[model samples]
Target: MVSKGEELFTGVVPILVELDGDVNGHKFSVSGEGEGDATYGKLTLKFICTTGKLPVPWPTLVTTLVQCFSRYPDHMKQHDFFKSAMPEGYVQERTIFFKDDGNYKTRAEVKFEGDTLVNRIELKGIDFKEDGNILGHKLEYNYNSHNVYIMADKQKNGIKVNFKIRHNIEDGSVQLADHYQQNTPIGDGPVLLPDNHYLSTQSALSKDPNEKRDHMVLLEFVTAAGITHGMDEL
Candidate 1:
């Protein structure tokens, strides 16, 4: 029988293995693939919300080379760049879905080349309401930095929360570098990943940790598939 590793090496990745935890009521689904050959050295994985309230129109985040699974490759510091705006070896085209006057207009995008990382968000014409107040009308992450960008609409101004943390193999928990919003800084401190557990407005506002292990599992899986260590890891 071909092992899971073999499947990934051959490009037969099975996405959405399971749903893990809640981040301010947002449930995340995990998926990824490894290139088990000299061409690649690390696993590429993504974490996305299948249910619950997402910070933006779409709900997902990707972590590469996390070393979270025994079958995955080791984590490297350079891999962190993909989460940044200056992503290395990144190549993806921006796509628009549905009609401009349709029920909904959405953008589907792959942040990095190889389309290794994927994400989507609403530009306008969507209303997220709770307690009679609409939430998150306009949402986007910066193309250069991947940081939370425009998150506003008629009811709200923009995303005020700005907290992010990663599960590190070396440090266990490490808060990622902060991003600026109108000259203001966010994510200034470190917190445990389990305590926060997912990305959401509530968690970001409270400076809570976000889940990284599941995403890591995907990274490890792809790495073991013999994915080259060159561009993807860098």
Candidate 2:
């Protein structure tokens, strides 16, 4: 067993339970939440819920991920940015699905040269609700590590803030990197990647940590495989 106040969290993560939650009448809350065999580097949420009351405690059913998963979200919509935006080069290999505000997909592609290859997925729309554990610092880490670009329709980076621990839905998560950051040396707005894309986090960020985040709704995770030049350029 580990002792309290030890140098553990830095190396070994805590196996915390789902209890940092609150329920004041119809208003409810929980810390760090998720669904269905959710396996993360530091946490796992087997089943959870937060409500005013529950009659008799002989449970016939157990909720996984969200306590009320079956009947939430008035309705959901699907988007296909890959098939619609990413040209013929992507060979949709694998994908992940999610629902915070609406149904979402993060698809991976095998990548091709002439008409192929790369890995990336976009969740054009998701509410990215504040209650779920996926918000705040969780997304803060995501905004830090990925090459998340902010595209206003088709034209990327016309320039761009925030509050609450969370801002947008994260349907997929992937790392995109190029040793030398930025497509151009002297540019403003979000950071750019080797593939010539940008992230919501700005190179010249404004004050107020929450207000500075450049994320747009439904931030996507695209792979670096679609780089115009070959890796040989590196």
Candidate 3:
């Protein structure tokens, strides 16, 4: 049983996002834990990136830092809900730091209410105002008796990717699951490819027309299993 004024994150797990096909290829993973019924508390997410086959310069690759949502009280996954509920005359700060040397790389903050939004992003000693609908493509939030999908799509420098966090309700309990690099372009449509199918199929056909039949959509998922059960468990 959960106490009053307290929300429980039933499916407390680890979620990870990664990109491997373009200029920006790194992994971000986070885990959630709560005692008894008190949950949905403040979350701190930290990420670091290293050189991995890609020839990205060390200065940019080594100090990759990312963080979001110092405090989130809503049970909903929709970011708009957070933006809409943002108190009037309130401001939220966002900062990106270098994980390698513990130095600040970017200083930013967002303030929003209704249709008026203002955000300042400072990078490499330059300040700029970020406008609407530029970085990401779409935002989706779905919920039902047995399923929930919170996702966002983004495209940058010819790299297309979708990030999703899903939970399926079964027997009145929600469990998080995976749908790995399942998004594969097919001859006429998109299909879900099974695990370990990318390398053998994609690489073997890389030299032929069949390889070009569908552009590969690189996907990744990091979960609590990374620590407890390892990638094999997924």
Candidate 4:
């Protein structure tokens, strides 16, 4: 007989939040990650939306304009944590080198002589101030980059916040981070963490159930996995 590795429900629940009157019918998909008891707080939160209305009342900060290439110290740097390394040259008051995304070949030629650093830059918009980093929030990987979520989310007119996580969630603490202030828990505050399975959220900006903002938290909940995971084990 095939001895199947027992799949147990260690109390890790998956949650999904939907936006009512959804224009694109995007939902926030939250899923538990592992079987370890400490892994209950370890999960992935993905929000996919397009074309209007999100839940939180987070304020849009400004565009993300990072220098194409600047200086780096011995082993440290500005945005170095996410900056892809590649050397290029430019001259104005002086001839110097800097780094770039390494993907845009044309982005560099555009930088002509005498043009200020402002001209040659990697730009992104709708960059929220509460831009909580992935590494901090427990999401840092080769496939995902910090703040890329904003540009992509804003561009798609949708939100795709994905992560495995980094914080001390093993102790069991989680949330909804508003992108405009670090005052919230986990460094990105204006946060709201529900009490283990219950709550209805509304538009932090417009709440009458009539208007549809880009982000709207119509209904949200935190629940146990139940029989979904190959039945609760012995």
Q: Considering every candidate listed, which one attains the maximal lDDT?
A: 1
Q: What lDDT does the true structure give each of the candidates?
A: 0.25, 0.21, 0.21, 0.20
lDDT of 4 by residue, 1-234 (tens): 100111111233333322211111222221111111212222222333343332211111011101122122212221121112111222111111111101111111112123221122221222222223221233211121112111112232212222121112323533222222100111221112111111011111112355333332221111122122221231
What lDDT does model 2 reach?
Answer: 0.21
lDDT (tens digit, per residue) of candidate 3 on 11-34: 232323222212222222211111
> Per-residue lDDT for 66-159 in model 2, tens only?
1001111111101112212212222221111223322222222212223212222222213434444232322322233233332122243211
Clashes of 2: 15
**TM-score winner between candidates 3 and 4:** 3
- The alpha-carbon lDDT assigned to residue 112 of candidate 3 equals 29
TM-score of each: 0.22, 0.19, 0.19, 0.16
Model 2 segments beyond 4 Å from truth? 1-26, 33-47, 52-225, 229-233
Question: How many residue pairs clash per model?
Answer: 23, 15, 0, 16
- Tens-digit lDDT track for model 1 on 43-150? 333443444334322212332112112122232322221122211212221212212211122222323234233232222223223221112223222111122222
